[PDB]
Structure formats: structure tokens, C-alpha cells
Amino acid sequence: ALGKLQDVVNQNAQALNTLVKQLSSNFGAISSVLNDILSRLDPPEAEVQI
Amino acid sequence: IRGDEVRQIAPGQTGKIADYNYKLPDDFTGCVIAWNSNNLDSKVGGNYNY
């Protein structure tokens, strides 16, 4: 019965969940984790991936 | 410098002289100039004054 309120909470939570989940994607770089990108590559080649 | 170590002396690159002897900022602006110098500097019998 309380569909409208439920939908509002569900949509907001799904947006936050997607925003947090997007931190796992590399976006074309070689690793999602920033520390690996900074360490494995030297600073002047690390910057472009970052 | 010795001939084999010209290509290391550039912003962002390393090497023994590039590290402990002469290093450029990784964000350097300008020009680097080099040429063969056996004719005027090197002497027969061994040039070691450097």
C-alpha cells in the first residue's frame, strides 16, 4: 500500500549504491585502486592514468 | 657526459647520473643540447681529467 514512500527510499538508495560501486571501475586505466596506479608506474607516467 | 647516458637526462627519467649526479625537474621547460666531443676534448692515451 505504501508504494510511494517505498519507491522514494529505494530510488535514493539505488543511486547511492551505484555511486559507491562506480569506484571499482578503472575507466580505461590499469587498476581501480589509486595506490597501485601511483606505485607501479613512476610519477610522470602514473599521472596520466590518475 | 658519457655517450650512453644522454637519453636518460630528460624530465621524468632516471639513471645513476640522472639520480645522484644531475637531475631535471619532472616539469622542466626548455631545451637540452648534446653533440659528439671526441675531437676537441678527448686526448690520445686516455682523458681522465673528468
UniProtKB/Swiss-Prot annotation, chain B:
Region (Integrin-binding motif): 2-4
Domain of life (superkingdom): Viruses
Main function: Attaches the virion to the cell membrane by interacting with host receptor, initiating the infection. The major receptor is host ACE2. When S2/S2' has been cleaved, binding to the receptor triggers direct fusion at the cell membrane. When S2/S2' has not been cleaved, binding to the receptor results in internalization of the virus by endocytosis using host TFRC and GRM2 and leading to fusion of the virion membrane with the host endosomal membrane. Alternatively, may use NRP1/NRP2 and integrin as entry receptors.
Phenotype upon changing residue 45 to S: In strain: Omicron/BA.1, Omicron/BA.2.75, Omicron/XBB.1.5, Omicron/EG.5.1
Assembly and oligomerization: Binds to host ACE2. RBD also interacts with the N-linked glycan on 'Asn-90' of ACE2. Cleavage of S generates a polybasic C-terminal sequence on S1 that binds to host Neuropilin-1 (NRP1) and Neuropilin-2 (NRP2) receptors. Interacts with host integrin alpha-5/beta-1 (ITGA5:ITGB1) and with ACE2 in complex with integrin alpha-5/beta-1 (ITGA5:ITGB1). May interact via cytoplasmic c-terminus with M protein. May interact (via N-terminus) with host bilirubin and biliverdin, thereby preventing antibody binding to the SARS-CoV-2 spike NTD via an allosteric mechanism.
Record protein name field: Spike protein S1
